[PDB]
Amino acid sequence: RHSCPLGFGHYSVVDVCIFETVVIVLLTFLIIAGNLTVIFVFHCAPLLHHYTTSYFIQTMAYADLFVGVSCLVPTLSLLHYSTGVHESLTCQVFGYIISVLKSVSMWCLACISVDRYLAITKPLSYNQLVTPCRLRICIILIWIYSCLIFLPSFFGWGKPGYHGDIFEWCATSWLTSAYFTGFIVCLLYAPAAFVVCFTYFHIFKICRQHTKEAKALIVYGSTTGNTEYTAETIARELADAGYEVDSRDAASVEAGGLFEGFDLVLLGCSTWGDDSIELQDDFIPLFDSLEETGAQGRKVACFGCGDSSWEYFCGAVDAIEEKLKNLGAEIVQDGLRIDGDPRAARDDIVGWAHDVRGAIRRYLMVLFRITSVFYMLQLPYIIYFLLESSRVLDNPTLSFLTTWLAISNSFCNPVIYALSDSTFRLGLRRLSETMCTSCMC
Ligand SMILES: Cc1cc2nc3c(=O)[nH]c(=O)nc-3n(C[C@H](O)[C@H](O)[C@H](O)COP(=O)(O)O)c2cc1C
Numbered sequence: 001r002h003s004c005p006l007g008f009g010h011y012s013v014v015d016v017c018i019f020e021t022v023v024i025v026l027l028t029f030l031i032i033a034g035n036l037t038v039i040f041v042f043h044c045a046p047l048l049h050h051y052t053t054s055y056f057i058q059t060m061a062y063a064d065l066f067v068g069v070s071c072l073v074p075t076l077s078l079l080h081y082s083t084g085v086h087e088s089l090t091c092q093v094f095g096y097i098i099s100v101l102k103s104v105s106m107w108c109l110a111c112i113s114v115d116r117y118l119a120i121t122k123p124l125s126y127n128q129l130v131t132p133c134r135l136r137i138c139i140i141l142i143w144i145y146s147c148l149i150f151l152p153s154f155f156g157w158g159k160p161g162y163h164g165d166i167f168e169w170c171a172t173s174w175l176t177s178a179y180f181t182g183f184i185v186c187l188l189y190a191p192a193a194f195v196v197c198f199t200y201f202h203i204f205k206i207c208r209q210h211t212k213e214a215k216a217l218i219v220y221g222s223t224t225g226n227t228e229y230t231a232e233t234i235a236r237e238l239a240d241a242g243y244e245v246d247s248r249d250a251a252s253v254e255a256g257g258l259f260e261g262f263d264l265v266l267l268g269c270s271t272w273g274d275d276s277i278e279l280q281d282d283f284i285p286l287f288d289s290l291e292e293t294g295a296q297g298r299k300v301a302c303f304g305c306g307d308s309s310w311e312y313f314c315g316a317v318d319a320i321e322e323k324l325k326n327l328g329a330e331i332v333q334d335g336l337r338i339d340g341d342p343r344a345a346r347d348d349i350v351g352w353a354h355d356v357r358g359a360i361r362r363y364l365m366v367l368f369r370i371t372s373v374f375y376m377l378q379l380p381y382i383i384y385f386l387l388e389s390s391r392v393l394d395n396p397t398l399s400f401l402t403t404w405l406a407i408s409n410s411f412c413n414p415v416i417y418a419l420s421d422s423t424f425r426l427g428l429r430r431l432s433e434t435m436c437t438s439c440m441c
Helices: 018-044 051-070 072-079 087-121 123-129 132-149 168-173 178-208 226-241 283-288 315-326 346-358 362-389 396-407 409-420 422-440
Strands: 215-221 244-249 264-269 299-306 336-339
Touching: 018 051, 018 072, 018 396, 018 409, 018 422, 051 072, 051 087, 051 132, 051 362, 051 409, 072 087, 087 123, 087 132, 087 168, 087 178, 087 362, 087 409, 132 178, 178 362, 215 226, 215 283, 226 244, 226 264, 226 299, 226 336, 226 346, 264 315, 283 315, 299 315, 299 346, 315 422, 336 346, 362 396, 362 409, 396 409, 409 422
Parallel strands: 215 244, 215 264, 264 299, 299 336
Antiparallel strands: none
């Protein structure tokens, strides 16, 4: 209370430590609001692509949310409007609950990697091996195991980390054990880091030695032939890449198991309707029975032709994207919306098709990135914890920065999802629309 984290050797019982306070108030609001929306997007999403990976992401989202709600207490201590009672107790609990959560996410990242490893190495075996029962067992085990590797903090085995250095009591009253540090390294950091390292090494080496012929389907609806030209343009672009393309007219296809077999599905539709958004006549039946196509888990993307003079430029691309999202499709890229003549927009269509080919690996890239940013944000804390448990270097400012740089990973996951996952961005947009509906009613 007399000290200050970035206080630079000065002691004054007066200071409110505003710089540290605002940095913490800012990180509390960003960790809560960011993960609240991730959780609400899941709540509104009817079906998912990558059900198990999404379940570990939702667990990480709750873990990160609980960090922010848990970060109200040290923020309350910095404002000290009401500091409650028993600061040392308050501090111990806070340091623990924020140590178990950084581990819950540590294991969810280890499990998502194993999940993707299994989906690649044993693809036929995967669906019997990774089951809802084993997944629920696995997540309950991550919450139980996390509480146990940090439980000796309450049974005089020493302090488990600097998550409590914020409160004055843990800076003076608490001291870390190199035995406790060595035990939690061999039970959390070393095993979870090894798992992630091992799995990603294998999965990325497999993505090299694939040589697997990629089969893509295009289904277009055109009443004047523009989406058909755009489809044909897209097809030639994918064929040039190496794809086995089947471009079919929507009026010639039956909905039943239509997407089955294909690694990529592009859906084209022009927009129609006199004072309405209506789908192209040939697509209307395909859209109404899109359920039967096998859209779940499917890497899909949309494109269409429209006229910008219309209130909803390519409103069909919007309707199709919304249903595909709701059937558990992975929308790998924001839809291509062609204004007037597509023959004039060939460079756009080629560019979009080029990008959609690089958008397939996007789901693996985000998981690897979510993990890569996690380890480089908690690596400083574990190497500072590694040393200061052995007492090699002891700094309150380095403790604050490493601690809150690790506490900062909690708001990073939602910004990676928001600026990389096209299905997520779409779920986020529709969530906003529902908030304005509650606002009206
Ligand atoms: C009745 C009517 C409604 C239309 N509504 C829209 C619209 O809401 N949004 C849009 O972008 N284009 C709209 N258009 C323009 C068509 O989407 C455009 O002509 C398109 O290039 C047709 O492509 P197709 O050849 O693949 O049918 C409309 C055209 C008609 C005749």
